[PDB]
Amino acid sequence: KKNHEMLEGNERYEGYCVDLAAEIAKHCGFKYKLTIVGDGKYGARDADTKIWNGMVGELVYGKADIAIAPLTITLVREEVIDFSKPFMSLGISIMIKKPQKSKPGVFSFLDPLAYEIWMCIVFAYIGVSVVLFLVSRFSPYSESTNEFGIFNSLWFSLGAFMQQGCDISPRSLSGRIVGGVWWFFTLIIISSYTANLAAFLTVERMVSPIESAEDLSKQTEIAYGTLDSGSTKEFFRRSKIAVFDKMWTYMRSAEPSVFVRTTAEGVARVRKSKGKYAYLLESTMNEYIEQRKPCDTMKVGGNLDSKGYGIATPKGSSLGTPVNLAVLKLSEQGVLDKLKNKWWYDKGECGAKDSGSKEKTSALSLSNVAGVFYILVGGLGLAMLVALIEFCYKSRA
Amino acid sequence: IFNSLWFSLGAFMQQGCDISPRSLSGRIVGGVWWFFTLIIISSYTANLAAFLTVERMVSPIESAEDLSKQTEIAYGTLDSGSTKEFFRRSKIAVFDKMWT
Amino acid sequence: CGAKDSGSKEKTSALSLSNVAGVFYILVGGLGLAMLVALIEFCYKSR
Amino acid sequence: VGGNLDSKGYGIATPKGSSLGTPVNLAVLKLSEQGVLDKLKNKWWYDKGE
Amino acid sequence: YMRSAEPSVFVRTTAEGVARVRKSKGKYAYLLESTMNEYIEQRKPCDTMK
Ligand SMILES: CC1=NN=C(c2ccc(N)cc2)c2cc3c(cc2C1)OCO3
Ligand SMILES: N[C@@H](CCC(=O)O)C(=O)O
């Protein structure tokens, strides 16, 4: 609870399981004491010792009378503890960081050519302009037999680069050599720009985000892990399905260890790791974290399986049947679904954008070329300002 | 005015017009508009060459929740079937929407 | 290790100055040739 | 398209009070633990995958 | 695949398989020994590459 440091007793806790425990206590009529598990693990039978840890250990060894907690009903646990009928159902899901905040920069139109090419294009433009002035304008031995002053030279070379032509063309031999070599340069550079832009806009489609849990087994660029001592680790261990077996083999041979002690550590790892690491988790944990800030996450692909949550009791305990009956009654009454909405859907503040799904529409957006419009309007304003200052100077003098 | 409309139309395509600004601020407008049209035309042809390659576009339903919001695609189950009964009793908000 | 199958997905990356370096050499050589030709014609017509 | 809307399976059914219920429940459990269910699922879904 | 594919992909004689591959626009492949493959590859019409 927000005031758990000051509250005492069961008032310190809140959530789906706390409300479910309250409803179960009300229906059956017993008093209950909510206790945090000392081990921290969900539960599994340790190798070569058969000692159950976590929840199953607490239940079997007489430490606890009931476990109203997100426990997945599994066959290997039914042999030592008794579960109630599934009060909620889910499946194994896949967690991965969002593709990218790949928003195009304002000046993203300069991207197809490196900064050095633009710098050297400006330098080559200045050099060609100055040379085309020098070549066409020193004495023929009147001398002004052509219109290629320095300003007209700059205009001609700028027009030649943009492939828009110009009102003049060099008439001497050496002026024509300059024109020809500049024409070849601008042809090569414009073709290269178009070709490279097409290359980017094409290979930006083969991105093909991973899904279906089969891409994880197919490649190893994106690492994935599983909660330690959880039922998902056992699910991957026991399963003989080819894709699940392959992911099991990789995660067993992968180093450093991909396991996380607690689910929160896994969430932090997958959030921080540049989208390189994936987390294998249950669907409800995926869909709740998906709906909570910073909301840097989605849920990808369908559920890997179908396993339900149940309230577990020590084997042979008198609490098993009444609690199971209460769970079934609440399922009939819809209190379980109501609490599901209350704690999953009623805590949402989404959102639901940037899915890059249907939304994604080729039709290149304005944001990709928005810099060109800024340059255009800036140039228009500058031209009006230049005309005004020229008019003022030429009228006042 | 009409000659300038023709020029700025001629400059957007790559067809050289029969006049040129010949002043300083006129040449500034001409130059910046030439750069704009160069970038836009190159983007159009590069994007088209991107699309004519590669396929696997469009999808009507992806999240199984869009059917509750969309109406152009009708959806139904087997009559007197278990799916019909499940929709008939489900209290999930989105499932209740589709059932209604 | 392993390449995935043939994917090798990545950004295209921008053309470096090495890719179009030759056209700049062509251009500057053209400017040098043009200045040489202009001066040759000027000196020929100065005699 | 999309994921599973619900989560429930397919089960062998008998009329209420039929003596056949317990043996067939034992049989389906034995098949599940023997992996025969997976073999039949492969034989009827994945072998004809062309 | 060869056990599940229909119609039968197997051939009675090697020459039948070679003719099948040549006539089948490249949609059919033949499985054969390397040395005998080297001989068919080196004789006309010589459109057969390993
Ligand atoms: C976010 C990206 N999106 N825009 C273009 C781009 C460039 C020009 C125009 N008109 C439209 C779009 C791009 C092209 C690239 C590139 C990076 C980018 C940035 O690296 C290799 O070529
Ligand atoms: N709640 C699971 C932990 C792993 C999982 O999310 O499946 C368990 O009871 O072991």
Author numbering:
A (entry chain C): 409 to 549, 565 to 820
B (entry chain B): 573 to 672
C (entry chain D): 773 to 819
D (entry chain B): 723 to 772
E (entry chain A): 673 to 722
From the primary publication:
Excitatory neurotransmission is principally mediated by α-amino-3-hydroxy-5-methyl-4-isoxazolepropionic acid (AMPA)-subtype ionotropic glutamate receptors (AMPARs). AMPARs couple extracellular binding of Glu to ion flux across the postsynaptic membrane through their ligand-binding domains (LBDs) that are directly coupled to transmembrane (TM) helices that form the cation channel. We used cryo-electron microscopy to capture AMPARs bound to glutamate, while a negative allosteric modulator, GYKI-52466, and positive allosteric modulator, cyclothiazide, compete for control of the AMPARs. GYKI-52466 binds in the ion channel collar and inhibits AMPARs by decoupling the ligand-binding domains from the ion channel.
In the second scheme (GluA2-γ2IS-2), the receptors were preincubated with GYKI-52466 in addition to CTZ and Glu was added immediately before freezing. Each approach resulted in similar inhibited states, with each domain in the structures only varying by a root-mean-square deviation (r.m.s.d.) of 0.3–0.4 Å. Next, we measured the ion channel radius, which indicates a closed channel; the upper channel gate, defined by Met629 at the M3 helix crossing, completely restricts channel access (<1.0 Å radius) to both water molecules and sodium ions. Both inhibited states captured in this study are markedly different from the resting-state AMPARs bound to PPLMs. While both the activator (Glu) and the negative allosteric modulator (GYKI-52466) are bound to the AMPAR, the positive allosteric modulator (CTZ) is absent from both cryo-EM reconstructions. This indicates that the states we captured are markedly different from previously captured states of AMPARs bound to PPLMs, as CTZ binds to both the resting and the activated states of the receptor. A structural comparison of GluA2-γ2IS-1, GluA2-γ2IS-2 and PPLMs bound to resting-state AMPARs reveals that we captured a distinct, allosterically inhibited AMPAR conformation. While there are no notable differences between the GluA2 ATDs (r.m.s.d. = 0.7–1.0 Å), there are major overall differences between the structures (r.m.s.d. = 6.1–7.0 Å), where the key differences among GluA2-γ2IS-1, GluA2-γ2IS-2 and resting-state AMPARs bound to PPLMs occur within the GluA2 LBD. The substantial rupturing of the D1 interfaces in both GluA2-γ2IS-1 and GluA2-γ2IS-2 places these LBD dimers squarely into the desensitized classification of LBD dimers. The distance change of 6 Å agrees with our GluA2-γ2IS-1 and GluA2-γ2IS-2 cryo-EM structures, which show a D1–D1 (Leu467) distance change of 6 Å when compared to the CTZ-bound, activated-state AMPAR structure.
